[PDB]
Design a protein around this ligand. Structure first.
Ligand SMILES: O=C(c1cccs1)N(CCO)C1CC1
Ligand SMILES: O=C(c1cccs1)N(CCO)C1CC1
Lengths: 237, 300
């Protein structure tokens, strides 16, 4: 069934699973035309496909050329997402294929189900949480590779850096979700927290700064505050 | 005009013949139904007074043999049987008619309702959906499940309707996932019409038979099948114009005949609102949309 708070540790068991988020697949800027009408201009996007146990991120970059001459783009975007996820699964060795794919938006269920008919033993599941995976384009290195792309491209990352050397998947995913919630809630303040100290660097092969265990506790506390204040301050409290 | 005699009526029962019905009291001198119009299939159906559970009945065509009803006190139901001795049958019927112990099929002359509900329904096709080849007539009841229902448990007692499944490899060509899911014309015209049913008449016949079993027996799997066959046409952008016009007539008469007090269980809100207001054919079912809006505006 649906993935929710009640079955949260299931994410970190030994059944291979993927989250798929399609929020950033079809991205536009809205602008005025010379005649005073409104038009969209598409910009590059990405599918965010994440193994929550290992941190492996399959980032399929969606180049704007895939929209050329097409209609009903927001609908096509869901089917394109399902096509690419299905292609990714077929490219993996059998023993690496997922047993479940969890979609962050219910509108992805039928497109993925149809594209995965060849895989009757892969469960396609919705989630009840409002997971903040849309903020992935607030991660600077991810945003950079998406916007620079000149053609369709898959880029692989570990979204946990080296954290799993010191913490469990359960803790790593919780830290990721907290950082993404911070980035979603107030991007500027969140990014100030993460880079304020010039002595804490981001290794070339990492996405996040090299915080010590102690520094992560401080950082995570600061993200909770920013998110607590804003949840208070947004419900004006 | 043919006759279905009854040996007797030992238990109190509501007997239906097509869209008509009448009450027979325990041990009342009822000996059958006469003046049944030749040229159509018919259904004779039963609801016992004690146990309104289990409506059941028989589909038959008097051109295919001489049929009668006889109550079985062991199995507790009225059974259809074939009489092979033709002179014995004529002699029985003639005597029951002389003693005026039969009800008359009560068709009004202007009234085309039964033809309109059974236009494409043929005994030969009923007998492939309801498999029991030693009989020329077919038993159906409220509880019987469909083959597709059994895939999701006695195979001999099943309704073998054509399986329709919109998220199936049969429905979806590799490489046309989005196209075929959003526009089911491929599945309708190539897979089902050209491949399985061979023509639109057999498709309509199964659709009409499914509706009639839903209405007369409350058969839930039949109702699912009727709505699936409607939805498959409405969700196809490319349907022959003659099929759309005929479908509108078919559904019009089904909706016209449906008891108003059964509409809540027998009509699926999602399918009908999709078909009439969102689908490719939202503007192709004028008669059906007008009777639905005037008779069941709540559903919509
Ligand atoms: O902060 C939390 C909270 C847990 C329990 C109350 S807050 N996160 C991120 C961990 O740093 C996740 C739910 C565990
Ligand atoms: O605006 C917010 C939040 C603000 C601050 C922390 S969460 N939410 C969370 C729902 O309560 C919106 C749904 C996206």
């Amino acid at each position: 069934g649906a993935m929710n708070s009640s079955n949260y540790a299931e994410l970190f068991n030994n059944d291979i699973k993927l989250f798929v988020d399609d929020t950033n697949v079809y991205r536009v800027t809205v602008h005025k035309t010379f005649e005073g009408n409104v038009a969209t201009k598409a910009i590059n996007g990405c599918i965010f496909t994440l193994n929550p146990k290992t941190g492996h991120l399959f980032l399929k970059i969606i180049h704007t050329s895939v929209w050329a001459g097409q209609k009903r783009l927001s609908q096509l975007a869901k089917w394109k997402t399902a096509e690419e996820v299905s292609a990714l699964v077929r490219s993996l060795p059998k023993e690496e294929q997922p047993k479940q794919i969890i979609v962050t938006r219910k509108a992805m269920l039928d497109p993925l189900e149809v594209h995965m008919l060849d895989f009757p033993n892969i469960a396609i599941r919705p989630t009840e949480l409002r997971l903040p995976f849309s903020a992935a384009m607030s991660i600077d290195k991810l945003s950079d590779v998406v916007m620079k792309a000149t053609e369709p491209q898959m880029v692989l990352f570990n979204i946990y850096d080296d954290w799993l050397d010191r913490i469990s998947s359960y803790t790593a995913f919780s830290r990721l979700t907290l950082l993404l919630r911070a980035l979603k809630t107030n991007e500027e303040s969140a990014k100030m927290i993460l880079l304020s100290d010039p002595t804490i660097t981001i290794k070339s092969y990492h996405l996040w700064p090299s915080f010590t265990d102690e520094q992560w506790i401080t950082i995570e506390s600061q993200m909770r505050d920013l998110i607590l204040t804003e949840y208070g301050r947004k419900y004006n409290v | 005009m043919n006759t279905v005699p009854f040996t007797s009526a030992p238990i109190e029962v509501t007997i239906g013949i097509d869209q008509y019905s009448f009450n027979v009291k325990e041990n009342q001198p009822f000996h059958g139904i006469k003046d049944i119009p030749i040229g159509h299939v018919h259904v004779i159906h039963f609801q016992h007074a004690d146990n309104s559970s289990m409506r059941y009945g028989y589909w038959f065509d008097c051109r295919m043999g001489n049929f009668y009803i006889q109550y079985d006190p062991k199995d507790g139901l009225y059974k259809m049987m074939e009489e092979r001795d033709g002179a014995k049958f004529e002699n029985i019927v003639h005597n029951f008619k002389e003693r005026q112990m039969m009800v008359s099929y009560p068709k009004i002359d202007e009234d085309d309702t039964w033809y309109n509900l059974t236009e494409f329904v043929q005994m030969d096709k009923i007998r492939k959906i309801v498999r029991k080849d030693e009989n020329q007539f077919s038993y159906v009841d409220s509880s019987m499940t469909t083959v597709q229902e059994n895939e999701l448990s006695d195979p001999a007692h099943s309704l073998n309707y054509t399986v329709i499944n919109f998220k199936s490899r049969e429905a979806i060509r590799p490489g046309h996932e989005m196209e075929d899911f959003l526009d089911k014309s491929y599945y309708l015209n190539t897979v089902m019409l050209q491949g399985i049913f061979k023509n639109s008449s057999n498709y309509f016949g199964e659709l009409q038979f499914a509706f009639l079993n839903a209405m007369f027996f409350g058969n839930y799997g039949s109702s699912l099948q009727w709505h699936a066959m409607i939805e498959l046409i409405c969700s196809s952008a490319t349907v022959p114009k003659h099929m759309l016009d005929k479908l509108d007539e078919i559904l019009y008469y089904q909706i016209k005949t449906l008891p108003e007090q059964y509409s809540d269980i027998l009509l699926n809100e999602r399918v009908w609102n999709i078909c009439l207001y969102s689908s490719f054919q939202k503007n192709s079912l004028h008669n059906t949309e007008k009777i639905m809006e005037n008779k069941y505006p709540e559903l919509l």
